[PDB]
């Protein structure tokens, strides 16, 4: 139980860090009028599908 | 200039700022408090950013026409404001001191051709001109320019 | 420029048009029908679902009646068969109503007289309906669709 | 000045009365139900008093200026009122009967110089002149003077 709990906390913390990184890199591009979102970051991170 | 594009934010009956409707983005200075005066715009999934201090969302398609045009090319020179004019020089925006006071922190900054170049955030008083802590659009980035010793509007 | 836009027929009535640009016959793919010109109707046309543009190569004889094209799209005012269109901020805007569903092929010209767009649809909004259009960037053809645009 | 000093109090869209901004306290008839219109004075603490029917509080310091002056002297005579005027005789305030109708009891009463003497609460008609059931301030005491049979406006 303890090992599995630690594994879950590790997985969840890592995944949260990943999604936080997703935010910290993509939110600078969602608050701009022009949704460029260059396909490099568009592929590397799942792109919000900006709607021209 | 364009009345129907700058919307005020209310906080217990007090206009604490404005939210602009520019470039397919409804936007407001995140650090100003309150809720949009428009009821139709109020029920939107806004999205914050502490490091940029600009809370924005998508303009619903029912009001898309009342949106300003936007630019990133910001030549050095003179630009417009809802309190008089602003002078852009050296990566800084300068205004006659005092003109514009805390509590109107959201109003935009237009260009000679009439299209939005910046969103005011704050003031920094030094001398006969106050430097306007402003949030701008680079080609793809959004950039904060806060002069040293600025103060939040 | 009357002999450069060919209408597409469905059971006796024009349901859209097929434009003749740049050594390519092209049409809004989603509209059904047959090219009115029989000589051009018997050509093979390569469709593309994700771009809604069905095109083919114009026969060598009639290349002359084809318009000139451009890719450089400055901010400003462009032409249309229904009055004018405005290009601003990466969108095309028309007066609402100017666009009727069913004239969904016709092109958008530029000031100098060369095709810059091919309308497909409209996203109705306020006084200025946005035009969902398939443009040609310098080497790609790209769809610009505002939300809720309805296929004309 | 005195034409934008008395802030109306709303209740589902009907003008149910006025709350006056008197001296240093923003008083209000402690009968009239509703919510004050300018929202800010509706968030201040509100000490009520049934026995006096005059519910007041301490004015937010921002709007200190826009508040009328007070007096205790009420020599026999003629006094002002937004529906005309009242006449102080025999310990009673007299108005043309009919002048003023139920629903607007909050309004002040000024003096010739202009110092808010009193705040009306209701009417009582007998003869051509209706007596006003009205609150005053003595040198140290708020006081109700209500003639018999008065029905609240």
Author numbering:
A (entry chain J): 371 to 422
B (entry chain L), D (entry chain P): 115 to 267
C (entry chain D): 116 to 267
Provide excerpts from the study:
Alphavirus spike proteins comprise trimers of heterodimers of glycoproteins E2 and E1 that mediate binding to cellular receptors and fusion of virus and host cell membranes during entry. We recently identified very-low density lipoprotein receptor (VLDLR) and apolipoprotein E receptor 2 (ApoER2) as cellular receptors for EEEV and a distantly related alphavirus, Semliki Forest virus (SFV). Here, we use single-particle cryo-electron microscopy (cryo-EM) to determine structures of the EEEV and SFV spike glycoproteins bound to the VLDLR ligand-binding domain and found that EEEV and SFV interact with the same cellular receptor through divergent binding modes.
To visualize how SFV engages VLDLR, we determined the cryo-EM structure of SFV VLPs bound to VLDLRLBD-Fc (resolution of 4.9 Å). Maps of VLDLRLBD-Fc-bound SFV VLPs did not reveal density for LA repeats in the cleft between adjacent SFV E2–E1 protomers, but they instead revealed additional density near the base of E1 at the two-fold and five-fold icosahedral symmetry axes. We obtained a 3.8 Å map focused on the LA repeat binding site, which allowed us to dock and build an LA repeat that interacts with domain III of E1. For the purpose of model building and interpretation, we used the VLDLR LA2 sequence, because our functional assays suggested that VLDLR LA1 is not compatible with SFV E2–E1 binding, and LA2 is otherwise located closest to the N-terminus of the VLDLR ectodomain and may be the most accessible for SFV E2–E1 binding. However, the density likely reflected an average of different compatible LA repeats wrapped around the five-fold axis. LA repeat interactions with SFV center on E1 residues K345 and K347. The aliphatic portion of the SFV E1 K345 side chain contacts the side chain of LA2 W89, and the ε-amino group of the K345 side chain interacts with LA2 D92, D94, and D96. Additionally, the ε-amino group of E1 K347 interacts with LA2 D94, an LA repeat residue whose backbone carbonyl coordinates the calcium. Nearby, the side chain of SFV E1 D327 interacts with the indole nitrogen of LA2 W89. VLDLRLBD–Fc could not stain cells expressing the E1 K345A or K347A mutant constructs, indicating that E1 residues K345 and K347 are critical to the SFV–VLDLR interaction.
